[PDB]
């Protein structure tokens, strides 16, 4: 996801272990907390970008496809979060 965007994610969750406990859909909308609760109270459509909007892959893709890339990026991202939090080995093979 990148150095800056990943760093903000831990800052929002407060720790790497706390971020590990989260599901894939929560990571997608970690940043967009104001749009989520407004939508849920007014029964509108929920947000889809969150903090992931500034990720490299989301930036390059077309605005029509920024909805698909958001969930695809997020779902694979949590596989990296769990592995780094609980794995005892430091390597970038799985991430690549």
What are the residues binding other proteins (CB under 8 A)? Answer: 7-8, 10-11, 14-16, 20-25, 60, 75, 78-79, 82-83, 85-87, 94, 96
Q: For residues 67 and 95, which CB has a smaller minimum distance to other proteins in the complex?
A: 95
Select 26 or 39, whichever has its Cβ closest to other proteins.
26
- What is each CA distance from 44 to 13, 34, 47, in whole angstroms? 26, 13, 9
CB of 5 to other proteins, least distance (A): 11
Both tokens of 7, joined, read 């760093």
Q: What is the residue whose two structure tokens read 């930036």? A: 59
């Amino acid at each position: 996801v990148g150095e800056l965007v990943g760093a903000r994610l831990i800052a929002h969750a407060g720790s790497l272990l706390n971020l590990a406990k989260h599901a894939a859909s929560t990571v997608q909308i970690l940043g967009a907390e104001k749009a989520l609760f407004r939508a849920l109270k007014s029964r509108r459509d929920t947000p889809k970008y969150g903090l992931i909007y500034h990720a490299s892959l989301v930036g390059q893709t077309s605005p029509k496809h920024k909805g698909k890339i958001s969930r695809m990026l997020a779902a694979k991202t949590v596989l990296a979060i769990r592995y780094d939090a609980f794995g005892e080995d430091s390597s970038s093979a799985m991430g690549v």
